[PDB]
Structures are given as structure tokens and as C-alpha cells.
Amino acid sequence: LRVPLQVSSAVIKQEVVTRLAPDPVPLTEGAIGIFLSGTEPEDSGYKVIDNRKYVYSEGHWGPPTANDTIYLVGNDADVCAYYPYKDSYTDKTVIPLQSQDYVETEDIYYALNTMINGFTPAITFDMVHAYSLVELKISRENYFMPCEISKITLKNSNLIKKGTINIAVDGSIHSSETGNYDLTTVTDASPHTLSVGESYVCRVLMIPVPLKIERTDAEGGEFGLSVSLVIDGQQMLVEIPYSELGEFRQGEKYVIGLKIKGTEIVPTVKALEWEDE
Amino acid sequence: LRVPLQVSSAVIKQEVVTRLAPDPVPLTEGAIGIFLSGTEPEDSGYKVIDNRKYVYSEGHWGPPTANDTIYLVGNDADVCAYYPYKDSYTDKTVIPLQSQDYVETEDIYYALNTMINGFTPAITFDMVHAYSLVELKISRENYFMPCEISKITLKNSNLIKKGTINIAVDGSIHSSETGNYDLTTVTDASPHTLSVGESYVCRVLMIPVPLKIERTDAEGGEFGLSVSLVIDGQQMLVEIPYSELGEFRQGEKYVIGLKIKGTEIVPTVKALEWEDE
Ligand SMILES: [Cl-]
Ligand SMILES: [Cl-]
Ligand SMILES: [Cl-]
Ligand SMILES: [Cl-]
Numbered sequence: 001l002r003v004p005l006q007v008s009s010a011v012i013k014q015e016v017v018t019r020l021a022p023d024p025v026p027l028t029e030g031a032i033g034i035f036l037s038g039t040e041p042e043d044s045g046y047k048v049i050d051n052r053k054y055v056y057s058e059g060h061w062g063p064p065t066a067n068d069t070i071y072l073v074g075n076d077a078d079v080c081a082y083y084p085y086k087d088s089y090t091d092k093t094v095i096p097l098q099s100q101d102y103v104e105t106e107d108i109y110y111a112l113n114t115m116i117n118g119f120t121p122a123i124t125f126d127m128v129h130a131y132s133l134v135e136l137k138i139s140r141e142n143y144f145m146p147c148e149i150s151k152i153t154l155k156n157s158n159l160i161k162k163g164t165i166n167i168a169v170d171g172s173i174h175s176s177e178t179g180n181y182d183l184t185t186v187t188d189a190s191p192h193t194l195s196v197g198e199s200y201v202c203r204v205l206m207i208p209v210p211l212k213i214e215r216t217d218a219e220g221g222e223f224g225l226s227v228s229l230v231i232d233g234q235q236m237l238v239e240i241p242y243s244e245l246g247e248f249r250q251g252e253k254y255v256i257g258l259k260i261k262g263t264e265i266v267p268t269v270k271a272l273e274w275e276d277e
Numbered sequence: 278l279r280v281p282l283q284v285s286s287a288v289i290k291q292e293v294v295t296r297l298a299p300d301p302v303p304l305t306e307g308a309i310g311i312f313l314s315g316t317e318p319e320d321s322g323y324k325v326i327d328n329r330k331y332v333y334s335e336g337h338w339g340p341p342t343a344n345d346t347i348y349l350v351g352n353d354a355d356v357c358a359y360y361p362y363k364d365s366y367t368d369k370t371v372i373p374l375q376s377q378d379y380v381e382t383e384d385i386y387y388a389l390n391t392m393i394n395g396f397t398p399a400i401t402f403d404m405v406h407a408y409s410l411v412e413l414k415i416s417r418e419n420y421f422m423p424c425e426i427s428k429i430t431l432k433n434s435n436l437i438k439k440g441t442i443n444i445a446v447d448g449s450i451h452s453s454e455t456g457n458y459d460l461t462t463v464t465d466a467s468p469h470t471l472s473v474g475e476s477y478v479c480r481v482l483m484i485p486v487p488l489k490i491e492r493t494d495a496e497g498g499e500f501g502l503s504v505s506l507v508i509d510g511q512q513m514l515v516e517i518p519y520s521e522l523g524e525f526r527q528g529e530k531y532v533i534g535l536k537i538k539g540t541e542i543v544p545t546v547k548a549l550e551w552e553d554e
Pocket of ligand 3: 279
């Protein structure tokens with residue numbers, strides 16, 4: 001005897017950074033990918049379900065057709081989910097991640113395993129962001145050249161370029177490629193000219209990682225992330241103090257303001273007697 | 278009946294800029310040029326003496342030989358002088374002036390006419406500077422290029438390049454050529470590379486002149502002098518506020534500090550919740 005799984009809602013978990021989290025915002029569009037496996041007993045009483053698509057329709061999440069229904073029996077099952085559904089994401093333990101310029105459909109949320117059975121078939125998926133959001137806000141002040149940006153690179157030896165996340169058990173990320181991140185929104189082929197009074201915003205989905213202290217100066221000051229920019233053919237490096245940014249944490253947004261101040265001659269005037277004393 | 282002129286001393290008049298003037302410093306070397314003409318009566322009783330050389334020797338100013346002695350009679354004479362003596366400066370009403378890079382022998386002092394006769398033949402020449410001294414102090418901060426200076430120009434429509442001064446009657450300056458002043462100590466042929474921590478000092482003998490307000494910005498702020506510098510092939514203009522420097526006054530020194538601050542990217546970091554509110 002079996003009853004259908006009841007997906008009550010899929011809500012977005014807001015991280016506590018500057019304020020306490022209000023009631024979570026429910027997802028009211030698109031599709032989720034659901035995984036089910038029988039809880040470890042050796043017959044669990046369940047056939048494995050990998051990446052079953054559930055769609056939001058008429059105020060609730062449900063199977064697109066009756067044959068897509070996920071059923072629960074008296075035995076316990078481990079159920080996890082992610083959003084937005086992707087047809088090829090067939091293994092919950094190795095869900096792909098890639099640091100990239102922000103694309104809304106690439107912003108993945110996941111809900112770790114919940115133990116559930118047919119006696120209490122109702123579930124709420126508490127969706128956490130898999131990535132960090134890095135937001136660059138680039139402006140000009142007293143700059144008298146075109147200010148054409150042809151390259152933007154995020155630098156730290158710990159940055160993860162590619163990896164996978166286990167959305168079922170612990171949300172642990174397996175790194176497959178590390179190194180500096182080059183933004184694709186601005187290139188030598190596709191450059192961006194920053195105008196006077198313009199605020200140029202570049203958003204990047206970044207794989208969460210603690211940053212390495214890359215430099216300690218004579219005064220003891222520590223530096224983690226660097227931002228390299230090619231402005232009017234000239235490479236400019238910006239060092240971010242480690243105390244200000246030491247880690248990219250899951251579900252947090254880091255707004256990095258970068259104000260380009262052009263070469264300046266500061267004058268001082270003092271009128272005096274011809275011969276000093 | 279005649280007695281020799283007695284040059285008691287030739288002293289430097291210090292201008293009152295920041296402190297009151299102490300006892301004037303006496304000139305104790307070199308030579309002065311003396312002019313004598315009979316005071317306006319029509320026979321004055323004097324033959325005109327133009328640019329007579331007097332030399333400092335054995336603690337006093339005097340003629341190099343007995344035949345060079347300047348004599349005074351009962352009748353009044355008008356006596357003026359300048360330092361340092363120049364063999365060709367034969368007309369006291371048109372003593373040449375030229376704005377130029379500082380050269381100590383080009384730093385002219387003059388004492389206006391004193392009425393004197395054989396009853397009181399002792400004179401003290403109160404020597405005033407004919408020029409203003411402009412002193413540029415050029416430094417670097419956060420500059421990552423060679424910082425090779427190939428040109429320095431002082432800019433204002435009122436600047437006098439060449440002229441003459443009447444050292445006898447009033448010290449009034451007759452302008453013969455106006456315009457911007459180009460320093461000769463640094464050229465494309467002869468450039469200067471400013472090193473890290475270096476303070477490059479450029480001194481200029483400038484013909485005294487009130488400066489013109491060359492620009493008034495939207496905020497009402499007024500600008501007089503400009504300093505144009507060609508650093509690593511790039512022309513850089515520095516505007517001096519008119520309130521800070523409105524005139525080049527005779528015998529005053531103007532120290533103009535110019536700190537070259539290279540292009541800088543200022544970073545700001547704020548960690549936040551992913552979705553703002
Ligand atoms: Cl059934
Ligand atoms: Cl000096
Ligand atoms: Cl005699
Ligand atoms: Cl966003």
C-alpha cells in the first residue's frame with residue numbers, strides 16, 4: 001500500500017549575514033529535480049528514483065503526468081531535491097558546479113536528504129544556494145582616457161573553477177579544477193567602455209571556498225583576493241584585505257566596489273621670505 | 278671743493294611675508310654698479326656717472342683704483358645702485374630683466390635714488406630683489422612608471438618673459454614680451470627621471486606681475502597660475518587656486534609642491550544576503 005509524496009512547497013533559505021531571516025520565499029515557477037532512495041536498513045523496499053521532474057502548477061508542485069508520481073510506502077526513504085531542474089543531472093552525489101558569469105538558470109539551490117514515509121508523506125524543500133555571488137561595481141573618478149576595460153580576473157590560489165556537490169548527504173564540494181577566474185562578459189574581442197558617472201556591474205556565480213592569505217606586507221596587513229583589470233591596455237591589480245574578505249560562503253553576496261582614480265597632481269602653495277631661517 | 282662718496286654698506290632688504298625683518302644682511306663680496314646724476318635744479322654741477330664699478334675689499338665698498346672715485350660737491354646728487362655689477366648695464370632707467378631658470382648672478386638687487394651731497398657723503402644701499410622666486414618641489418606617490426619629466430611650463434596670460442626696470446626713480450617694470458614660461462633645466466633633449474622618494478627642486482627667477490583669473494568653475498572657485506608637465510610623454514595640467522597665489526611680488530619666494538599620484542583603484546567590500554530588501 002502506497003500514497004503519493006506531497007511536495008507542500010519549495011522555499012528559498014536566506015542566509016543570515018546582516019539581518020535575521022524572515023519567512024522563506026516560496027518558489028512559484030519552473031521545475032525541480034527530485035531524488036529518492038530507500039533509507040539504509042538488506043531490502044529498503046524502494047526502487048531508486050533519480051532526477052524526477054516535478055512542476056509548479058495551480059499553486060502546487062506535482063508530477064507533470066500521473067505516471068511521474070513518486071510513491072511512498074510504510075518504509076523510510078531519503079528524499080532530496082534541487083532547483084531549477086536540468087534533464088542531464090542524473091547523479092545527486094556529483095551535481096556539477098562551475099564558477100561562471102552570472103546566469104539565473106545556473107543559480108542552483110539544493111535541499112539535503114529528508115527521511116520520509118507514507119505515514120507523513122508531506123515534505124517542504126528548504127533550498128539553499130550552492131554558489132556564492134560576487135558582485136563587482138566599477139566606477140570612474142578624475143579619469144581622462146576612454147576607460148575601455150578588455151579583461152577582469154579574480155585571483156586567489158584557492159579559487160575553484162570546476163567541481164561537484166553532493167546534494168543528498170552533506171552538500172560537500174569536490175574540487176576538480178582550481179585557479180584564477182577570468183570574466184567572460186568583457187574580453188579583448190568584446191570590451192566595455194566605462195563612461196563618466198557610469199556604475200558597471202559584473203556578477204559572478206562563484207564556487208564557495210576559504211581564501212588563502214596571498215601576501216603579508218611590512219606593517220603586518222594580510223591580503224586574500226586580488227582583482228586584475230586591463231584598462232586602456234594597462235593591467236591594474238587591486239588587493240582586497242583578508243580581514244574584509246576571507247571566504248566565499250554559500251548563499252552570500254559580496255559587493256566589491258572598484259573606483260578607478262586617474263593620475264592626479266596635488267598642488268601646495270607657501271609664500272615666504274627669499275632667504276630661509 | 279669735493280669729497281669722495283662714502284659707501285657705508287650695501288644691505289639686502291628682506292620682505293615681510295611670514296615674519297618681521299631683522300637687521301638687514303650686508304653684502305660682503307663682489308661688485309656693485311653705481312649711478313650718479315645731479316638733482317634737478319639749469320646746471321646741476323655734476324657730470325653724469327653711469328654704472329661705476331665699486332668693489333668690496335678690506336671690509337668696505339670702494340673704487341677699484343683712485344681714478345674710479347665718485348666725488349660729491351655742495352650741490353645735491355641722485356645716487357642709485359644695483360648688485361651684482363654687469364659691465365654692459367649702462368642705463369639705470371632700462372636695466373634688463375628676463376624670466377629664467379634660477380642663476381645666482383642673475384638675481385639682481387637695486388637701491389632707488391638717494392639725494393646726497395658733500396656735507397653728508399655717507400650712503401647705505403638698501404638693495405631690494407628685482408625678481409620673484411618660484412620654487413617647484415616635485416615628488417611621486419603610488420606611481421609605477423619611470424616618471425621621466427621632459428617639459429615644465431608656468432602658465433598665465435599676464436606672465437612677463439622680458440622687460441626692463443627703472444632702478445633710479447620708482448622700480449617700475451616695463452614689459453616687452455608676455456606669455457607662458459618654459460623651464461630650460463628639463464627638455465626633451467635634456468629630461469629628468471624622478472625617482473621614488475626624490476624631491477626634484479626647480480627654481481625660477483620670475484618677473485613680478487599680478488596674475489589673471491584664467492578660470493572660474495561652477496562652484497565659483499577661481500584659478501590663476503597653471504603648471505603643465507610632460508611626464509612619460511603624457512601632458513598633465515595642474516591648476517593653482519587664485520586665492521592661494523594671485524601675484525608674484527618682488528622679493529618673495531613661492532614654494533609650489535607638486536605630488537604626482539599615479540592611477541589607483543580603491544576597493545570597498547560589503548557582505549550581504551543574496552536577495553536585497
Ligand atoms: Cl496507486
Ligand atoms: Cl633660494
Ligand atoms: Cl680731489
Ligand atoms: Cl542578484
